[PDB]
């Protein structure tokens, strides 16, 4: 049957898709429910507003169009999830109907109060990715929670800014906030609970989560947050030089006026495909178009906002994969041995030149991070130099910022649960020495192993993978229900382990994997090196 439901703007018709598995009930899907007016013409580069009511019944059974993007271009190939850049041809199937009026969202409703809502902020960078890639229907039926997956403006059309009021920027963040507002004031009609809205995302989307915590625009819209593999303080989280890249794009497209408003208007007069398919390359380990520190959405530098405690006590579930810098070591991933000592001194030097570049501390810092990231008991192993390079990139970009944000959130008494993900599905082209890479927790959170391999995830899933997917889905849904991964639904070696909080004095975390155990400190030596010694050099 087609269970039409009435919203504050009208009525919409959905479907009743039946799941492959025999332990999951049917899920009602409303695909393509709009939440903001189409920003096509003079509303381009303006914050979104409420939609237009429609008479009669709206017909929502097909996936909405994607936002304009150039997938087959010079994407940032480091920050993207590994499964995205491996199966890039299959990912282009979903981005086929790219249209500017892409502001829609898809709700998956399962069939002990009203069901909680879980909004998903997708993305690997800010210039790619659509919500149709993830079928949030297995997660909805298993956890008895409503799962929402949206589309928001990406890249040039959503984050272009100049610094002044001609184009402030952060249009994607305001689109996400508008979607949260629509959920807050319209989810009770769908059976959801508008006071238990958990918001979660992996990768660049995760950064958006940590920027929606610090925005006063999203005050009472949500209550919890699950930020996995991403922070607001990494090198590629925000854009501190938006004017430079904006002017570069304006010159490339064909109009660069010394007055910002004139150039912005000219860009507004240009077709989306013409200004999206252009190629503007950012500096390495940085972004061209992304969130901008202006004063309305993000008041200050995110590294400074959370040190002074400018957030409203959101329950947090942060996490890190074992090795995520798997694309740092890619030119040497097809060699019998690891990286040579002549090349291990080269990648580190380029790393320092691209991330610090300080004329003073360029020779003392480089030598000390060369000394720290080498196994002195195996100084001439070869492979245990590629491994340490991967560990270096993971520690600098993903582990140290995650632990820093966890400590800053815990020091102001907000419940923080830290997790580490180790297991990974046996892919096709993945090297044997590799481990859980960036974005290799999404299959388990979204219940892919319970429906088998898809075009995006072609690994073969065993019984252990299904058990792990069930466990992590139970953890996530327990968090969305009660704000504590153990309270509502007990586990059914995962049974007897109790997940503890993350106190700054003793940084308890959970080591999610085939052999879980509540450990006590994640890479304490290297995390302390990156947080406490490097600033002194």
């Amino acid at each position: 049957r087609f269970p039409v439901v009435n919203t504050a703007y009208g009525r919409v018709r959905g479907v009743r898709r039946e799941l492959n598995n025999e332990i999951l009930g049917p899920v009602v899907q409303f695909l393509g429910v709009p939440y903001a007016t189409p920003p096509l013409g003079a509303r381009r580069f303006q914050p979104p507003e409420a939609p237009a009511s429609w008479p009669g019944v709206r017909n929502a059974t097909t996936l909405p169009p994607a936002c304009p993007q150039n997938l087959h271009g010079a994407l940032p190939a480091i920050m993207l999830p590994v499964w995205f850049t491996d199966n890039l041809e299959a990912a282009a199937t979903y981005v086929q109907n790219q249209s500017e009026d892409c502001l829609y969202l898809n709700l998956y409703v399962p069939t002990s109060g009203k069901k909680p809502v879980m909004l998903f902020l997708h993305g690997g960078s800010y210039m790619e990715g659509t919500g149709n890639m993830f079928d949030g229907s297995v997660l909805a039926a298993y956890g008895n929670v409503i799962v929402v997956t949206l589309n928001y403006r990406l890249g040039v059309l959503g984050f272009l800014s100049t610094g002044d009021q001609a184009a402030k920027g952060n249009y994607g963040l305001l689109d996400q906030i508008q979607a949260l507002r629509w959920l807050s004031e319209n989810i009770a009609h769908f059976g959801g609970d508008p006071e238990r809205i958990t918001i979660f995302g992996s990768g660049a989307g995760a950064s958006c989560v940590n920027l929606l915590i610090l925005s006063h625009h999203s005050e009472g819209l949500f209550q919890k947050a699950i930020a996995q593999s991403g922070t607001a303080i990494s090198s590629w989280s925000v854009n501190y030089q938006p004017l430079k890249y904006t002017r570069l794009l304006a010159a490339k497209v064909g109009c660069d006026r010394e007055d910002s408003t004139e150039a912005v208007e000219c860009l507004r007069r240009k077709s989306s495909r013409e200004l999206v398919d252009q190629d503007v390359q950012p500096a390495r380990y940085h972004i061209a178009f992304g969130p901008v520190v202006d004063g309305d959405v993000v008041p200050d530098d995110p590294e400074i906002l959370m040190q002074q405690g400018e957030f409203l006590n959101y329950d947090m579930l942060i996490g890190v994969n074992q090795g995520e810098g798997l694309k740092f070591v890619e030119d040497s991933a097809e060699s019998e041995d690891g990286v040579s000592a002549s090349a291990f001194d080269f990648t580190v030097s380029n790393f320092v030149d691209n991330l610090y570049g300080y004329p003073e501390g360029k020779d003392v810092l480089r030598e000390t991070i060369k000394f720290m990231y080498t196994d002195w008991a195996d100084r001439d192993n070869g492979e245990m130099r590629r491994k340490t390079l991967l560990a270096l990139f993971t520690d600098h970009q993903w582990v140290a910022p995650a632990v820093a944000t966890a400590k800053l959130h815990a020091d102001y008494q907000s419940p923080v649960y830290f997790y580490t993900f180790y297991h990974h599905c046996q892919a096709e082209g993945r090297p044997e020495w590799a481990d859980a890479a960036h974005g290799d927790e999404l299959p388990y959170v979204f219940g892919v192993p319970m429906v088998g391999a898809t075009d995006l995830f072609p690994c073969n899933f065993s019984k252990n993978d299904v058990m792990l997917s069930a466990v992590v889905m139970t953890y996530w849904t327990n968090f969305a229900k009660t704000g504590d991964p153990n309270q509502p639904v007990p586990q059914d070696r995962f049974e007897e382990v109790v997940w503890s909080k993350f106190n700054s004095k003793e940084k308890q975390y959970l080591h999610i994997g085939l052999k879980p155990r509540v450990r006590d400190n994640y890479r304490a030596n290297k995390v302390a090196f990156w947080l406490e010694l490097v600033p002194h050099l």
Binding site: E219, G309, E310, F311, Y412, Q413
Partner: protein, 177 residues
């Protein structure tokens, strides 16, 4: 005209303790109370953060003038009603609305006082833990009558007469009727 509580000889204090998992942090606050006393120096309501944090909000009478002093992280900002006589034994009502660094104070029907401290100011009152009524531990005991502590929808004086588990009464605080 609510649950009026009488202070007596010696002193007294009312304590509201939030549940440890539900300590709220608010960008804006509203503190309303009607009171009647003749003390020249007193501390009526003192709101504290959790352990260690220096975030606090206090309503107090200094030299007879009522005023609100709060610390949100940068500097201690105080807005005080001084152009009136308020401790004359009559029943007065004071409402204080804080929005970020901006403060607004009103007493009875006298015109509102606005305070806009200069510079960039922190806006978030972090992890409120305890509401203290009477100022026994502050050093200025209270001798008078209080009525209607409305604080972000948590009327502590309303629940004080209901013998709530979280409310603590220590001292010679007395309730009419």
């Amino acid at each position: 005209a609510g649950t009026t509580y009488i202070f007596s000889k010696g002193g007294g204090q009312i304590t509201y303790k939030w549940p440890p998992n539900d300590r709220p942090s608010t960008r804006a606050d509203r503190l309303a109370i009607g009171f009647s006393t003749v003390q020249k120096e007193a501390v009526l309501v003192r709101v504290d953060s959790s352990s260690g944090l220096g975030d606090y909000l206090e309503l107090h009478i200094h030299q007879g003038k009522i005023g609100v002093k709060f610390n949100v992280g940068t500097d201690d900002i105080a807005i005080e009603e001084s152009n009136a006589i308020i401790n004359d034994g009559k029943y007065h009502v004071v409402r204080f609305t804080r929005s970020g660094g901006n403060a607004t104070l009103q007493v009875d029907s006298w015109p509102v006082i606005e305070r806009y401290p200069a510079g960039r100011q922190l806006t978030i009152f972090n992890s409120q833990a305890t509401i203290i009524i009477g100022g026994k531990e502050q050093g200025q005991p209270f001798q008078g009558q209080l009525s209607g502590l409305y604080y972000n929808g948590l009327k502590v004086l309303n629940m004080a007469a209901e013998n709530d588990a979280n409310i603590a009464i220590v001292g010679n605080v007395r309730l009419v009727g």
